[PDB]
Design a protein around this ligand. Structure first.
Ligand code: FES
Ligand code: FES
Ligand SMILES: [Cl-]
Lengths: 160, 166
């Protein structure tokens, strides 16, 4: 199964933005992670279209989270970058060939499609149960309480 | 996310092979699902490499399941076709840039990596909990108990006849 390569970068960007007390340009986030500015901007633009970040305009501008970290799930961020479409796409092959499912018996989804859907629901539910706030609390505990504030200070420095 | 297109066909083939009392050629499975025999043979070869089917040789050969339906999970079939590699691969981006987390504090996997790994473990656990036998029981209930036996009869009908009239 393939997942958008943007997900790692986008989740890291959401975590460090919680520590920024002012808007952070995409270029500064890109410098932090030593990644293509253009590539990271595309991920921030996907987060913007999903209403998770807002681009504040001006030379004092850059990205901010649109709501508290506790209200942003990992599923919110992953679906922003990877998309909401199901991984398993049923193309109704049960309706093909000489012993095709009777048309009146196609009101329920294929049992195979339903089983694949249940697995995707388990993946989504796992991501929905964790927030950016949860990731921050883990980083505080594992890296220490000054790790993310240090990143935050670095991200906003030179602006004020 | 995105799964290999062969998965839908492969799962359907495993279900209908439970109803067949003799080997079923890829071309006969392909006729049942109205699909290119070469395309379907590619999916059956993936199932063969994973040890889930065997291609029996000779005039009355074809594919057979290698163990009972209750011993074949959806995860077995999906990994056979789509592959076992994780969807999310951590590339240790925490170890990049001017504030890079040094290895000393990288004794554990990144919290983000652990969360993504937990979600994939949940997807795998769901697919591992359902067998081909479970799908057959659902079909028996929803299509009626003659549906899959009828498919099995059709799949084995007139096998070994390859010299068709001009
Ligand atoms: S018709 Fe699509 S999974 Fe069965
Ligand atoms: S370093 Fe890879 S997910 Fe955080
Ligand atoms: Cl916050």
């Amino acid at each position: 199964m393939k997942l958008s390569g943007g997900v790692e970068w986008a989740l890291h960007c959401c975590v460090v933005l919680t520590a920024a007390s002012r808007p952070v340009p995409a270029a500064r986030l890109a410098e932090l992670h030593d990644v293509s500015p253009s590539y990271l901007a595309k991920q921030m633009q996907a987060l913007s279209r999903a209403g998770l970040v807002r681009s504040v305009q001006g030379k004092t501008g850059g990205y901010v989270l649109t709501r508290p970290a506790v209200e942003i799930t990992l599923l919110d961020v992953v679906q922003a970058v990877d998309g909401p479409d199901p991984a398993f796409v049923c193309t109704e092959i049960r309706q093909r060939g000489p012993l095709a499912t009777p048309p009146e018996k196609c009101t329920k989804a294929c049992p195979i499609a339903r089983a694949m859907g249940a697995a995707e629901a388990a993946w989504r539910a796992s991501l929905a149960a964790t927030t950016i706030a949860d990731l921050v609390a883990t980083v505080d505990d594992e890296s220490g309480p000054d790790a993310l504030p240090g990143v935050g200070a670095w991200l906003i420095e030179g602006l004020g």
